[PDB]
Amino acid sequence: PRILVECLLPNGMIVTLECLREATLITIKHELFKEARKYPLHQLLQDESSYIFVSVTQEAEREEFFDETRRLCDLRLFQPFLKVIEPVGNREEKILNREIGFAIGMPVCEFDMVKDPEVQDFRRNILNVCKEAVDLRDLNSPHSRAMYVYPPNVESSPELPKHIYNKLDKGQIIVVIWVIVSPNNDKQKYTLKINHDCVPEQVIAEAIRKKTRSMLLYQGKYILKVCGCDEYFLEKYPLSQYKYIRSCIMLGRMPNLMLMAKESLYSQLPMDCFTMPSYSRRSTKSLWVINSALRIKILCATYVNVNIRDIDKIYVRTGIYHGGEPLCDNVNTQRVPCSNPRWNEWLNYDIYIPDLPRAARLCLSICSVKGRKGAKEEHCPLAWGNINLFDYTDTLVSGKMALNLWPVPHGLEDLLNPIGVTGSNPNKETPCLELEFDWFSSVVKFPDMSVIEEHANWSVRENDKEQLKAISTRDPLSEITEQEKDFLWSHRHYCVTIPEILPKLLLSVKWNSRDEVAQMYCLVKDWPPIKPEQAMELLDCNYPDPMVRGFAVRCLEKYLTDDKLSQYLIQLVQVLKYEQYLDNLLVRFLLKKALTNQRIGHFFFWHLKSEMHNKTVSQRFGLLLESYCRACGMYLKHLNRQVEAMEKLINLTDILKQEKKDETQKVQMKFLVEQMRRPDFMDALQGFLSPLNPAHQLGNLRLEECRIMSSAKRPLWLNWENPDIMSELLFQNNEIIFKNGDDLRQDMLTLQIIRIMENIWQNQGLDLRMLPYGCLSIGDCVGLIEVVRNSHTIMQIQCKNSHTLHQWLKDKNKGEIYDAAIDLFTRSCAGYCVATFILGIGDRHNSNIMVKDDGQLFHIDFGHFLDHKKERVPFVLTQDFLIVISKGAQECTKTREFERFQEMCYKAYLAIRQHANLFINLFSMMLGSGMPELQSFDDIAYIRKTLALDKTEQEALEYFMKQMNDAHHGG
Amino acid sequence: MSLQDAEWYWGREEVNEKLRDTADGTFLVRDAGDYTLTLRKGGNNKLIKIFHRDGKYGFSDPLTFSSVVELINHYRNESLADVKLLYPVSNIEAVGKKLHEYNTQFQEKSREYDRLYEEYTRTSQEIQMKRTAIEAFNETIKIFEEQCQTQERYSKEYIEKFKREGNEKEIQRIMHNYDKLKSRISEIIDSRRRLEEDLKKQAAEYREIDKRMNSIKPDLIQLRKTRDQYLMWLT
Ligand SMILES: CCN1CCN(c2ccc(Nc3cc(Nc4cccc5c4N(C(C)=O)CC5)ccn3)cc2)CC1
């Protein structure tokens, strides 16, 4: 309503405008100038359409609302005051910056404030990647822009597994082409039987031949769309290579397609305009010549939050590291009383300066001392901080430095944290620590590549050949003995023939040396390529060398397909944090991929935004999000639609979470209905692309079916319509669960791992079907979960004896469908038995397992994905499950159904156990993600144990058999 | 000599914990014949597998040395070259009562640490919000100061007393706005000072919350060792 805004005219006189809460800026400005006439000095004031507004929002940013039609509600103004001043800046730049700031979550002016030369150089240099991506997109318009907007959702290889191939009708699939070409939508359906290797062009040609009575002779004028969703077959791929088509083949469903005019989507595609922002306009000695042991001085820690009585003394542990393995033993500073944290000591390290690796670092930690306990005086690290020994331009840090030490992470028993951010804590109340380095009377830089490849090149049977392969096949998380390292380095030259041995030979190199590192460089320069699943290892903390990671990124670019890149994307985004600098090859690759494909880009943005609330990776991810949104194209307008939408939900839950968390769900439901009936909530929620899948569009909310669940966290059961014309084909209603306060990165990881397991088993020929449904974390403890429909929890089915579930399954599939309803049930049951045994998912009661009416069985909630509750078969097959698998009997355990079931389980288990490196990598690259249950190497040691990697194939199979017999009481 | 009872022998997490921040030359032999020896050198725990073949033990072929204890003794006598193997790492009712008491103590320490951590994170949230509000107040006060400067620059020139035009506008209107404008600027400055004072108070309280945090850890980790050693006896 009337908020009594204040207006500051250019004359100076303050005017009180009684403006309603939901009012636009144009009307307010008009009323303000109308009232200004009564005020004095109205001579100076110009016409209304000659001045612009300025205000300060809740983010402490001074911004000019140029013409924003959003009411003063959406302004988010800090105080109800508005100054009037003649506009100075460009409307385009300010509007784009405002949109970018809303999408990112932090105003873009902050990056302009940051004075760090590396930050400014990255900001001005990522524009090169942005510009090349934008140029590539507009190379072959409007086709290229269309492919960018609606990318081909296809598989990795055209060749099909034999089982699905036999599922086809002799290589012919029966699709249905819907044509709505008429004055009114009539949905002319044509049933067309065509090969599974025909490109969509031939599909359309043969559709035209049919539609036209029985023949005609359209071409280059129509395209194919998936009815009920926004996915288009614009690419020249075999019709069965698209994910929807192959999913329909596997699931035994008719692919219902649609014929749409090309000009329809070409005109539906707004033109993207990328404009270079304002900021784009703005004695060396070889490091090997210097010969002196590295020395660094510690001066004083100005601020320290310690207790004098509880802490006797303090000292600064230091180490010269490379990855996580010290180059030389840690040096220490003499203990001093906590009151006077001044040391002024020149620590001397054992590492000869020329032998410094490029990825070297200096990890410092201020920690106390307490000798009261006795012989083992406990040490606690008060604060930590890392410092790269080389600048982004290959220069040794010299002179003095002031480092704000981050707080020690929870659970970090050790004293030095060599994996953390290599930068000063942005917060200025943090404990500073002053440092000084040596001065060499000149700038010292790492020697140029050509210089290194001259040192090396001047400083240089089956009895062993089997050992190399045995090592290479070994886990990357296993242990390597010194004889193994010496053996590998002795046969470094011969290791080229085994290209998959770099992840191991790298550990065999002494980074403390110069000849060894030079030879390793000359080797990695001419290394045969490796697989992307093996080049994701070379992109972890273990391997921080510039050239190693450059080679790994080259392999990723050359061989990583978009389908894989869209799956191993969480891991790559997370590994972005552990990169040394801001301008590196991996970020360029990921940014180009995200800018040349909106399917990858949407999840790229959402992952970055989710991880951009931990202050450690706030700045880097904010810079990257700015670089993306500058050249994101028009998708910004969509992303904002999602962003604010989620906000409108978040706040609501909070109001229910604590404010009204006093009465039962009746009052909560009434309040939810009342708040949803408000115009703001109704207008914000409806009409936007679903974050889980951008293809699905959410229409008017069906407030009738939106309720608050009975689950402990009390999530939101949000129900939406489908605005698409052909919604009846796929699904007329779209449902989602909004969970506030529950971490959803654990569920995301488990579902990604289940998807990878399903892919492995499909390739192996084991048609085990699982539901790895959608799940996103849009922040911290806030998330969206897909709702699977027509599926009832096992508790409900039993509630609605040991035969209740089987009786229900028989009822839902009366007739010949019983065979399929039992086969699919058993296959899914085997798949989850193996999967939840290997990953040790939390113990399963009835509520966590639900079955579709068809027969499939899936587990819904997760959050114990490495058995962190202090092996531990969670999915012990209940009596009802075995009765259903055996088709009903009292001698169940003695039927051929058991034999087939156990054989499929063993096949799946062995197939997974043959691909343990991938799962170990996926779990290890996300150790720092901060999940409550993936936080120490024992968590991945559990995976190593369950797969029985140490044992042999027969031993592992016998171990799984023993575990099964123990779990389901023998069999 | 006999095995299964020795200082070096122990029969990976435990090995790493024992060798963590240990002196150079330390060596611990444990099974993973395997008989893997973990030796601390260069700040890192190197591993050497003791090969057992033809009833003979040895680091590298030939396995001339006879017994694992013989290997340990011989390489304690002389350096491994290049580092000598220096100093190695080696009632029921009462134990039950001690275990119960230390379990209770560990639960108390964990609860206290959790409460301190939650208070720390909360106070950090309010600290950040208050700092942002203070910066917004600074910006608003700067804008108001600019407005006041412009008003003072303009009023005298545009419309001073009756000379140009001051019959009753300056007394009733011209000076009314200038004083009315100054009322809000002063109050805005007042709000900044009041909120700034609160921020300093929270910093001290947030400071104190850290003092209790950086003292409980020494008294809780040592609790784990007492709990770990007593709990992991069960004999
Ligand atoms: C013999 C084999 N050795 C040597 C190689 N080693 C190793 C394996 C994988 C990674 N990758 C990684 C490491 C990350 N940090 C952490 C590294 C070590 C411990 C912890 C980490 N935590 C964080 C950051 O929360 C939890 C505790 C984060 C992401 N990825 C790094 C080192 C295993 C032991």
Residue numbers in the entry:
A (entry chain A): 18 to 234, 246 to 310, 323 to 500, 524 to 863, 873 to 942, 950 to 1050
B (entry chain B): 326 to 336, 340 to 360, 366 to 414, 421 to 429, 441 to 585
The authors write:
Of special interest is PI3K alpha (PI3Kα), a heterodimer of p110α and p85α. Cancer-specific mutations in p110α, such as H1047R, result in constitutive PI3Kα signaling, contributing to tumorigenesis by sustaining aberrant AKT-mTOR pathway. For example, the small-molecule activator UCL-TRO-1938 (referred to as 1938 hereafter) selectively enhances PI3Kα activity, demonstrating cardioprotection against ischemia-reperfusion injury and promoting nerve regeneration in preclinical models. Here, we present cryo-electron microscopy (cryo-EM) structures of wild-type (WT) PI3Kα in complex with the activator 1938, the unliganded PI3Kα H1047R mutant, and the PI3Kα H1047R mutant in complex with 1938 at resolutions of 3.17 Å, 3.09 Å, and 2.94 Å, respectively.
1938 adopts a “V”-shaped conformation, with the acetylated indoline moiety nestled within a sub-pocket delineated by I459, L1006, and F1016, where it engages in a π‒π interaction with F1016. The other segment of 1938 aligns in a linear conformation, with the core pyridine ring forming a π‒π stacking interaction with Y641. Meanwhile, the nitrogen within the pyridine is positively charged, making salt bridges with the sidechain of D603, while the latter also forms one hydrogen bond with the nitrogen atom connecting the pyridine and benzene rings. Additionally, the central benzene is clasped by N605 and F1016, allowing the linked piperazine ring to approach the helical domain, where it makes massive hydrophobic contacts with P539, L540, and L570. Looking at the other regions of p110α, residues 1002–1016 shift from the helical domain towards the active site, opening the allosteric site to accommodate 1938 binding. The 1938-bound structure also reveals conformational changes in the activation loop (residues 933–958) and P loop (residues 771–777) compared to the unliganded state. Additionally, a 3.8 Å lateral displacement in the membrane-binding loop (residues 966–974) was observed in the Cα position of C971. The ABD of the 1938-bound PI3Kα undergoes an outward displacement of 3.1 Å compared to its unliganded state, and a larger displacement of 3.5 Å compared to the BYL-719-bound state. Consequently, the enhanced flexibility of the ABD allows for large fluctuations in the iSH2 junction upon 1938 binding. These movements reorganize the interface among iSH2, ABD, and C2 domains, leading to a weakened interaction network between p110α and p85α.
